[PDB]
Amino acid sequence: GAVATGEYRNLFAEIGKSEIDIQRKIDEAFQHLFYGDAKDAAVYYQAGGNENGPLAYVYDVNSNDVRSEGMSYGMMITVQMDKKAEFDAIWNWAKTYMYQDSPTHPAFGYFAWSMRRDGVANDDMPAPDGEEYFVTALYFAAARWGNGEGIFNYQQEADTILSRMRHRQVITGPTNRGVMTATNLFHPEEAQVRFTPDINNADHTDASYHLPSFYEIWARVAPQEDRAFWAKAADVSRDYFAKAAHPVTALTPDYGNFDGTPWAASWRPESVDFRYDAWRSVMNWSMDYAWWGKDSGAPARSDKLLAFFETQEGKMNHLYSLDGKPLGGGPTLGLISMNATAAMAATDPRWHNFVEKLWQQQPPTGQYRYYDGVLYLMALLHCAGEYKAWIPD
Ligand code: NA
């Protein structure tokens, strides 16, 4: 695995791109998304400052709301790119405005998934993959930059936040969506991340939230009492992908049950199909394989997914039934980007075409640029060999 060798694959270089052009590709994506035209290109907004220094956020320019996932991806992008100032700015806004610190609030320990730009939460419940990226990005920040104090003691923040994700108790109380009751963020027996800690729908999961590549970091650096749990979670997720991905196409559903079957949410019964969440599943298992080499099924699964998408050339949708029936939409940058990351595990040389397809893209503009853009930039960093495990002491 790349973590053991320290050798991360530069998939763009393997398909013949020069390092100067690769660096320019990443630099342009970053510059557009972080510092581009405010109305058409950027998803990053500099939001003044407080006692911790500058504040900033990544936001969904469509809904005009700050999303915890985007904040956490922003932090991951910025630590990977050695952009401490931007990382610290994003973290400051997340921890200041999004994180619930009241021990009697049902969202205690969690970051609000959807928040208005004035700091008013739309929903105090978390999108758990946000928490997962926050913690991991914080450990990586500790490793790259060392720990500061207060909110910038990155390692202490990660440790506390991660411990609470596991050990959170059931709490009931008022929220911006009315009185709610919520629980921990990982099932204590199944060792799987929940789709939601809201007690009314807590016993479900989402394949795109399974991040064994990160659980392996936590198994090494978390509070000692929880390391065996995170190691279990890593193993569980590898089996989960094996069960949850369709055996022919390797498409996963947006939401799922702990046993691997698709789950139809009452408010979104189309969650049983391959849609916006499920685009990311392949990145998760491919990253895990590339880093750790433990998921012996990941190469075949990546190969299956790429073989499926090769059948869609010139008619690619972005919504699919798990057996591969198109359910609408056209190609999206986000899905192109995630498919390219399958090349971190794929063996069949058709992966070259998917990495070339990513190379041919450009930074997104317009109303849907947030989700496309954060996925694009993460995909560029993975495919350039620039998305690494930065394991702290
Ligand atoms: Na608690």
Numbering used by the authors: 5 to 397
What did the published study say regarding this structure?
Given its possible relevance to xylan degradation and perhaps even marine colonization of wood, DNA encoding the predicted catalytic domain (residues 41–436) of the GH8 enzyme of the bacterium (TtGH8; locus tag TERTU_4506) was cloned into an E. coli expression vector. E. coli containing the recombinant plasmid produced high levels of soluble TtGH8, which was purified using nickel-affinity chromatography and gel-filtration chromatography. In order to provide molecular insight into its catalytic properties the three-dimensional structure of TtGH8 was determined. The three-dimensional structure of TtGH8, determined to 1.5 Å resolution, reveals intimate details of the substrate-binding sites and the distortions of xylose within the catalytic centre. PDBeFold analysis reveals that TtGH8 shares close structural similarity to the reducing-end xylose-releasing exo-oligoxylanase from B. halodurans C-125. TtGH8 shares 43% sequence identity, overlaying 344 Cα atoms with an r.m.s.d. of 1.1 Å, a Q score of 0.7 and a Z score of 15.9. The next closest match is the cold-adapted GH8 xylanase from Pseudoalteromonas haloplanktis with 35% sequence identity, an r.m.s.d. of 1.4 Å over 341 Cα atoms, a Q score of 0.6 and a Z score of 14.7.
